Amino acid sequence: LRPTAYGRDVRSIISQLPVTDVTAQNIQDVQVVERNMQRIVGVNDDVAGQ
Amino acid sequence: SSPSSRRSATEFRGTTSFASSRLANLAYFFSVTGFRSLAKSLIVKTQQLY
């Protein structure tokens, strides 16, 4: 700490901004659309089979 | 048995044996009603006309 701040508490001065990606769950959605694509084309298709 | 949770062999055969059954009944209807008609007609002509 600088001279003018000799007695301050260390915890208060610097901190890291918190960030989160809310678009990180798009993965479950990708998986659905792909299954739906297999259904139209019929190359490796869920239907016909249990 | 369409629900699947780790099916064994008899189980696997069992739902498919059963699922096909409603489709086979359609076929049977189609066969008696219209395929038969066509077939009988072809047979008459081949015998008489040639």
CSV table of N, CA and C in Angstrom, one decimal:
chain,number,residue,atom,x,y,z
A,1,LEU,N,0.9,-1.1,0.0
A,1,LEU,CA,0.0,0.0,0.0
A,1,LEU,C,0.9,1.2,0.0
A,2,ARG,N,0.5,2.3,-0.6
A,2,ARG,CA,1.2,3.5,-0.7
A,2,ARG,C,1.3,4.2,0.7
A,3,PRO,N,2.2,5.2,0.8
A,3,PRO,CA,2.3,5.8,2.1
A,3,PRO,C,1.0,6.5,2.6
A,4,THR,N,0.3,7.1,1.7
A,4,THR,CA,-0.9,7.8,2.0
A,4,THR,C,-2.0,6.8,2.4
A,5,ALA,N,-1.8,5.5,2.1
A,5,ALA,CA,-2.8,4.5,2.5
A,5,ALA,C,-2.2,3.6,3.5
A,6,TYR,N,-1.2,3.9,4.3
A,6,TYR,CA,-0.6,2.9,5.1
A,6,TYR,C,-1.5,2.1,6.0
A,7,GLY,N,-2.5,2.6,6.5
A,7,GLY,CA,-3.3,1.9,7.5
A,7,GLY,C,-4.6,1.2,7.0
A,8,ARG,N,-4.8,1.3,5.7
A,8,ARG,CA,-6.0,0.7,5.1
A,8,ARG,C,-6.2,-0.8,5.2
A,9,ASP,N,-7.4,-1.3,5.1
A,9,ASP,CA,-7.5,-2.8,5.0
A,9,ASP,C,-7.3,-3.2,3.6
A,10,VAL,N,-6.4,-4.3,3.4
A,10,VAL,CA,-6.1,-4.8,2.1
A,10,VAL,C,-7.2,-5.3,1.2
A,11,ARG,N,-8.2,-6.0,1.8
A,11,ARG,CA,-9.2,-6.6,1.0
A,11,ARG,C,-10.0,-5.7,0.2
A,12,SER,N,-10.3,-4.5,0.6
A,12,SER,CA,-11.1,-3.5,-0.1
A,12,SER,C,-10.7,-2.9,-1.4
A,13,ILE,N,-9.4,-2.7,-1.6
A,13,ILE,CA,-8.9,-2.0,-2.7
A,13,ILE,C,-9.0,-2.6,-4.2
A,14,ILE,N,-8.7,-3.9,-4.4
A,14,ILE,CA,-8.8,-4.4,-5.7
A,14,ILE,C,-9.6,-5.7,-5.8
A,15,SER,N,-10.3,-5.9,-6.9
A,15,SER,CA,-11.2,-7.1,-7.0
A,15,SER,C,-11.4,-7.5,-8.5
A,16,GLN,N,-11.8,-8.7,-8.8
A,16,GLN,CA,-12.0,-9.1,-10.1
A,16,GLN,C,-13.4,-9.2,-10.5
A,17,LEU,N,-13.7,-8.6,-11.6
A,17,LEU,CA,-15.1,-8.5,-12.0
A,17,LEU,C,-15.6,-9.9,-12.3
A,18,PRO,N,-16.8,-10.2,-11.9
A,18,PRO,CA,-17.4,-11.5,-12.2
A,18,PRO,C,-18.1,-11.6,-13.5
A,19,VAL,N,-17.9,-12.6,-14.3
A,19,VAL,CA,-18.5,-12.7,-15.6
A,19,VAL,C,-19.0,-14.1,-15.8
A,20,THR,N,-20.1,-14.3,-16.5
A,20,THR,CA,-20.7,-15.6,-16.7
A,20,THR,C,-21.2,-15.6,-18.1
A,21,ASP,N,-21.3,-16.8,-18.7
A,21,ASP,CA,-21.9,-16.9,-20.1
A,21,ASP,C,-23.2,-17.5,-19.9
A,22,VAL,N,-24.2,-16.8,-20.3
A,22,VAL,CA,-25.6,-17.3,-20.2
A,22,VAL,C,-25.9,-18.0,-21.4
A,23,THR,N,-25.0,-18.0,-22.4
A,23,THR,CA,-25.3,-18.6,-23.7
A,23,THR,C,-24.6,-19.9,-23.8
A,24,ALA,N,-24.2,-20.4,-22.7
A,24,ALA,CA,-23.5,-21.6,-22.7
A,24,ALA,C,-24.3,-22.9,-22.6
A,25,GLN,N,-25.6,-22.7,-22.6
A,25,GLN,CA,-26.5,-23.9,-22.5
A,25,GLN,C,-27.1,-24.2,-23.8
A,26,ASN,N,-26.6,-23.4,-24.8
A,26,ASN,CA,-27.1,-23.6,-26.1
A,26,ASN,C,-26.8,-25.0,-26.6
A,27,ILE,N,-26.0,-25.7,-25.9
A,27,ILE,CA,-25.6,-27.1,-26.2
A,27,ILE,C,-26.7,-28.1,-26.2
A,28,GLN,N,-27.6,-28.0,-25.2
A,28,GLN,CA,-28.7,-28.9,-25.1
A,28,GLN,C,-29.6,-28.7,-26.3
A,29,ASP,N,-29.8,-27.4,-26.7
A,29,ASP,CA,-30.6,-27.1,-27.9
A,29,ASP,C,-29.9,-27.5,-29.2
A,30,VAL,N,-28.6,-27.5,-29.3
A,30,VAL,CA,-28.0,-28.1,-30.5
A,30,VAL,C,-28.4,-29.5,-30.6
A,31,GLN,N,-28.3,-30.3,-29.5
A,31,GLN,CA,-28.6,-31.7,-29.6
A,31,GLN,C,-29.9,-32.0,-30.1
A,32,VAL,N,-30.9,-31.2,-29.7
A,32,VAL,CA,-32.3,-31.5,-30.2
A,32,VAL,C,-32.4,-31.2,-31.6
A,33,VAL,N,-31.9,-30.2,-32.2
A,33,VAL,CA,-32.0,-29.8,-33.6
A,33,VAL,C,-31.4,-30.9,-34.4
A,34,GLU,N,-30.3,-31.4,-34.0
A,34,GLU,CA,-29.6,-32.4,-34.7
A,34,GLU,C,-30.5,-33.7,-34.8
A,35,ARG,N,-31.1,-34.1,-33.7
A,35,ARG,CA,-32.0,-35.2,-33.8
A,35,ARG,C,-33.1,-35.0,-34.7
A,36,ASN,N,-33.7,-33.8,-34.7
A,36,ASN,CA,-34.7,-33.5,-35.7
A,36,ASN,C,-34.2,-33.5,-37.1
A,37,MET,N,-33.0,-33.2,-37.3
A,37,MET,CA,-32.4,-33.3,-38.7
A,37,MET,C,-32.2,-34.7,-39.2
A,38,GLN,N,-31.9,-35.6,-38.3
A,38,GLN,CA,-31.8,-37.0,-38.6
A,38,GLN,C,-33.2,-37.6,-39.0
A,39,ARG,N,-34.2,-37.1,-38.5
A,39,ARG,CA,-35.5,-37.5,-38.8
A,39,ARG,C,-36.0,-37.1,-40.2
A,40,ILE,N,-35.8,-35.9,-40.6
A,40,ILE,CA,-36.2,-35.5,-42.0
A,40,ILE,C,-35.4,-36.3,-43.0
A,41,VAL,N,-34.1,-36.3,-43.0
A,41,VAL,CA,-33.3,-37.0,-44.0
A,41,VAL,C,-33.4,-38.5,-43.9
A,42,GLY,N,-33.4,-39.0,-42.7
A,42,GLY,CA,-33.5,-40.4,-42.6
A,42,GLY,C,-32.1,-41.1,-42.6
A,43,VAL,N,-31.0,-40.4,-42.5
A,43,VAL,CA,-29.7,-41.0,-42.4
A,43,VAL,C,-29.5,-41.1,-41.0
A,44,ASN,N,-29.6,-42.4,-40.4
A,44,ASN,CA,-29.4,-42.6,-39.0
A,44,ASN,C,-30.6,-42.0,-38.3
A,45,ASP,N,-31.8,-42.7,-38.3
A,45,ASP,CA,-33.0,-42.1,-37.8
A,45,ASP,C,-33.6,-42.7,-36.6
A,46,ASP,N,-34.1,-41.9,-35.6
A,46,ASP,CA,-34.6,-42.4,-34.4
A,46,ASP,C,-35.9,-43.3,-34.7
A,47,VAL,N,-36.7,-42.9,-35.6
A,47,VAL,CA,-38.0,-43.6,-35.9
A,47,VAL,C,-37.8,-44.9,-36.6
A,48,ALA,N,-38.7,-45.8,-36.5
A,48,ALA,CA,-38.7,-47.2,-37.0
A,48,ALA,C,-38.2,-48.0,-35.9
A,49,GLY,N,-37.6,-47.4,-35.0
A,49,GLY,CA,-37.0,-48.1,-33.9
A,49,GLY,C,-37.3,-47.6,-32.6
A,50,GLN,N,-37.4,-48.4,-31.6
A,50,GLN,CA,-37.8,-48.0,-30.3
A,50,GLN,C,-36.8,-46.9,-29.9
B,1,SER,N,-43.7,-51.4,-24.0
B,1,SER,CA,-42.2,-51.5,-24.0
B,1,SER,C,-41.4,-50.5,-24.9
B,2,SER,N,-42.1,-49.5,-25.5
B,2,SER,CA,-41.3,-48.5,-26.2
B,2,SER,C,-40.3,-47.8,-25.3
B,3,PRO,N,-40.7,-47.6,-24.0
B,3,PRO,CA,-39.8,-47.0,-23.1
B,3,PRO,C,-38.6,-47.9,-23.0
B,4,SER,N,-37.4,-47.3,-23.0
B,4,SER,CA,-36.2,-48.1,-23.0
B,4,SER,C,-35.3,-47.8,-21.8
B,5,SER,N,-34.9,-48.8,-21.1
B,5,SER,CA,-34.1,-48.6,-20.0
B,5,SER,C,-33.2,-49.8,-20.0
B,6,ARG,N,-32.2,-49.9,-20.9
B,6,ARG,CA,-31.3,-51.0,-20.8
B,6,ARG,C,-31.9,-52.3,-21.2
B,7,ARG,N,-32.6,-52.4,-22.3
B,7,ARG,CA,-33.3,-53.6,-22.7
B,7,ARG,C,-32.4,-54.8,-23.0
B,8,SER,N,-32.9,-56.0,-22.6
B,8,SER,CA,-32.1,-57.2,-22.8
B,8,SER,C,-32.7,-57.8,-24.1
B,9,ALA,N,-32.2,-58.9,-24.6
B,9,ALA,CA,-32.6,-59.4,-25.9
B,9,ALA,C,-34.1,-59.8,-26.1
B,10,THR,N,-34.7,-60.5,-25.1
B,10,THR,CA,-36.1,-60.9,-25.2
B,10,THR,C,-37.0,-59.6,-25.2
B,11,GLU,N,-36.5,-58.7,-24.3
B,11,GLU,CA,-37.2,-57.4,-24.2
B,11,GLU,C,-37.2,-56.7,-25.5
B,12,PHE,N,-36.0,-56.7,-26.1
B,12,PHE,CA,-35.9,-56.0,-27.4
B,12,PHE,C,-36.8,-56.5,-28.5
B,13,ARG,N,-36.8,-57.8,-28.6
B,13,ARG,CA,-37.6,-58.4,-29.6
B,13,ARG,C,-39.0,-58.1,-29.3
B,14,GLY,N,-39.4,-58.1,-28.0
B,14,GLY,CA,-40.8,-57.9,-27.6
B,14,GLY,C,-41.4,-56.6,-27.9
B,15,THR,N,-40.8,-55.5,-27.7
B,15,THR,CA,-41.5,-54.3,-28.2
B,15,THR,C,-41.6,-54.2,-29.7
B,16,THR,N,-40.6,-54.5,-30.4
B,16,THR,CA,-40.7,-54.5,-31.9
B,16,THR,C,-41.7,-55.6,-32.4
B,17,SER,N,-41.8,-56.7,-31.8
B,17,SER,CA,-42.8,-57.6,-32.2
B,17,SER,C,-44.1,-57.0,-32.1
B,18,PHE,N,-44.3,-56.2,-31.0
B,18,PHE,CA,-45.5,-55.6,-30.7
B,18,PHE,C,-45.8,-54.4,-31.6
B,19,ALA,N,-44.7,-53.6,-31.8
B,19,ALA,CA,-45.0,-52.3,-32.6
B,19,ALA,C,-45.4,-52.6,-34.0
B,20,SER,N,-44.8,-53.6,-34.6
B,20,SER,CA,-45.1,-54.0,-35.9
B,20,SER,C,-46.5,-54.4,-36.1
B,21,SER,N,-47.1,-54.9,-35.0
B,21,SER,CA,-48.4,-55.4,-35.2
B,21,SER,C,-49.5,-54.5,-35.7
B,22,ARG,N,-49.4,-53.2,-35.4
B,22,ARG,CA,-50.4,-52.3,-35.9
B,22,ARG,C,-50.2,-52.0,-37.3
B,23,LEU,N,-48.9,-52.0,-37.7
B,23,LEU,CA,-48.6,-51.8,-39.1
B,23,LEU,C,-49.0,-53.0,-39.9
B,24,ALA,N,-48.8,-54.2,-39.4
B,24,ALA,CA,-49.2,-55.4,-40.2
B,24,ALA,C,-50.6,-55.5,-40.4
B,25,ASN,N,-51.4,-55.0,-39.5
B,25,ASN,CA,-52.9,-55.0,-39.6
B,25,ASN,C,-53.2,-54.0,-40.7
B,26,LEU,N,-52.5,-52.9,-40.9
B,26,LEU,CA,-52.8,-52.1,-42.1
B,26,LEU,C,-52.5,-52.8,-43.3
B,27,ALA,N,-51.4,-53.6,-43.4
B,27,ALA,CA,-51.1,-54.2,-44.6
B,27,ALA,C,-52.1,-55.2,-44.9
B,28,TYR,N,-52.6,-55.9,-43.9
B,28,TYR,CA,-53.6,-56.9,-44.2
B,28,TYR,C,-54.8,-56.3,-44.8
B,29,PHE,N,-55.2,-55.2,-44.4
B,29,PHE,CA,-56.3,-54.5,-45.0
B,29,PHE,C,-56.0,-54.1,-46.4
B,30,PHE,N,-54.9,-53.6,-46.7
B,30,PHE,CA,-54.5,-53.2,-48.0
B,30,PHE,C,-54.5,-54.4,-48.9
B,31,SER,N,-54.0,-55.5,-48.4
B,31,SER,CA,-53.9,-56.7,-49.2
B,31,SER,C,-55.2,-57.2,-49.7
B,32,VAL,N,-56.1,-57.4,-48.8
B,32,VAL,CA,-57.4,-57.9,-49.1
B,32,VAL,C,-58.2,-57.0,-50.0
B,33,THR,N,-58.3,-55.7,-49.6
B,33,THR,CA,-59.1,-54.8,-50.4
B,33,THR,C,-58.7,-54.4,-51.7
B,34,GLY,N,-57.4,-54.1,-52.0
B,34,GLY,CA,-57.0,-53.5,-53.3
B,34,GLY,C,-56.0,-54.2,-54.1
B,35,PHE,N,-55.0,-54.8,-53.4
B,35,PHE,CA,-54.0,-55.6,-54.1
B,35,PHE,C,-54.7,-56.7,-54.7
B,36,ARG,N,-55.6,-57.3,-54.0
B,36,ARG,CA,-56.3,-58.5,-54.4
B,36,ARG,C,-57.0,-58.2,-55.7
B,37,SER,N,-57.7,-57.1,-55.7
B,37,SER,CA,-58.4,-56.7,-56.9
B,37,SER,C,-57.5,-56.6,-58.1
B,38,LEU,N,-56.4,-56.0,-57.9
B,38,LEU,CA,-55.5,-55.8,-59.0
B,38,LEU,C,-55.0,-57.1,-59.5
B,39,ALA,N,-54.7,-58.0,-58.6
B,39,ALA,CA,-54.1,-59.2,-59.0
B,39,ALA,C,-55.0,-60.1,-59.7
B,40,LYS,N,-56.2,-60.2,-59.3
B,40,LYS,CA,-57.2,-61.0,-59.9
B,40,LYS,C,-57.4,-60.5,-61.3
B,41,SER,N,-57.5,-59.2,-61.5
B,41,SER,CA,-57.7,-58.6,-62.8
B,41,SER,C,-56.6,-58.9,-63.8
B,42,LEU,N,-55.4,-58.9,-63.4
B,42,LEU,CA,-54.3,-59.2,-64.2
B,42,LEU,C,-54.4,-60.6,-64.6
B,43,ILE,N,-54.7,-61.5,-63.7
B,43,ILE,CA,-54.8,-62.9,-64.0
B,43,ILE,C,-55.9,-63.2,-65.1
B,44,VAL,N,-57.0,-62.5,-65.0
B,44,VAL,CA,-58.0,-62.7,-66.0
B,44,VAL,C,-57.6,-62.4,-67.4
B,45,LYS,N,-56.9,-61.2,-67.5
B,45,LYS,CA,-56.6,-60.8,-68.8
B,45,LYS,C,-55.5,-61.6,-69.4
B,46,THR,N,-54.5,-62.1,-68.6
B,46,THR,CA,-53.4,-62.9,-69.2
B,46,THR,C,-54.0,-64.1,-69.7
B,47,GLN,N,-54.9,-64.7,-69.1
B,47,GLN,CA,-55.6,-65.9,-69.5
B,47,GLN,C,-56.4,-65.8,-70.8
B,48,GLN,N,-57.2,-64.7,-70.8
B,48,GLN,CA,-58.1,-64.5,-72.0
B,48,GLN,C,-57.5,-63.8,-73.1
B,49,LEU,N,-56.9,-62.7,-72.9
B,49,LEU,CA,-56.4,-61.9,-74.0
B,49,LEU,C,-55.2,-62.5,-74.8
B,50,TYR,N,-54.2,-63.1,-74.2
B,50,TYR,CA,-53.0,-63.5,-74.9
B,50,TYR,C,-53.4,-64.7,-75.8
